[PDB]
Subunit: 168 residues, 2 copies
């Protein structure tokens, strides 16, 4: 159940934004850098429009692929008309990992207050592919990565983590 050595996971990163460009993709850059620095391999990275169909095409390709084990998504979880991440992803999940959105909103409430109601972070599993959708804010991503995701992607984490159950 628990390994004595760090075991790298294969991660794909996605930025949902109509204007965001590689240059001004701060959350995308943050997740890539944090992942690489922790020892994981980032095998793909893309930026898509806030479009529900563009999100489904990229994420479904990764769900069906042999190598992507984890998908990290930033953006598109807001309450506007164009925020489509949750709508695009929920129907693709085999199962939802409810502890993620709850613990994230809990930590986020202490950090930014009632503004945490403005985001709909959610995680799920499809074809053994782990998918985490977080807000576009870089601080939100740091809160999610350091206190929640990184620990669970680390094979040495007691009492248990995702390692044994990931694709391949």
């Amino acid at each position: 159940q628990v390994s004595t050595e760090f075991i790298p996971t294969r991660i794909a990163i996605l930025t949902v934004s109509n204007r965001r460009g590689e240059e001004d993709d701060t959350s995308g850059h943050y997740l890539r850098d944090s992942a690489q620095e922790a020892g994981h391999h980032v095998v793909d990275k893309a930026i898509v429009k806030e479009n529900r169909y563009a999100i489904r095409a990229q994420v479904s390709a990764w769900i069906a692929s042999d190598d992507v084990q984890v998908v990290l998504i930033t953006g598109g979880t807001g309450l506007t008309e164009g925020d489509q991440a949750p709508e695009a992803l929920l129907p693709l999940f085999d199962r939802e990992v409810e502890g993620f959105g709850e613990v994230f909103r809990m930590l986020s409430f202490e950090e930014i207050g009632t503004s945490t109601l403005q985001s709909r972070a959610v995680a799920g599993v499809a074809n053994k592919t782990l998918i985490f959708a977080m807000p576009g804010s870089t601080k939100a991503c740091r809160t999610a990565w350091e206190n929640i995701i990184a620990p669970q992607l680390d094979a040495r984490t007691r009492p248990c983590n995702f390692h044994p159950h990931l694709k391949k």
Copy 2:
């Protein structure tokens, strides 16, 4: 809106099968051939394993594409554990086109009898992409194309057809 002339549609064909290859794919061929012998353009074709995720990845790309207006799928609508076409697609739909399944099972009863209950044909629309999922049997494909889809894809058909609702 009914045109006075014929207007070609950009169609993508998909075969769902674990064994079938391009050579022994009678249904894929029939559809490409029929599609063309009617004046439409077949912009893409592919074969996927009877796998819910493989189907989702390929069909989501076509839905998000600028060129594919119509998708035709043969296979996987059965009642076995491996038949996943309906399961794969239903959640990708913006709207379901009930008329298809009901009509197809109607004309099919008149030809194969109660064996019509062994198929779960269905169609829907997603990002203006028209999606038809029919049985693997070439005879079924014939009944669907000739008696239901072909006419509906003919812009001259009255009282109405899909012409005005296809993605530009």
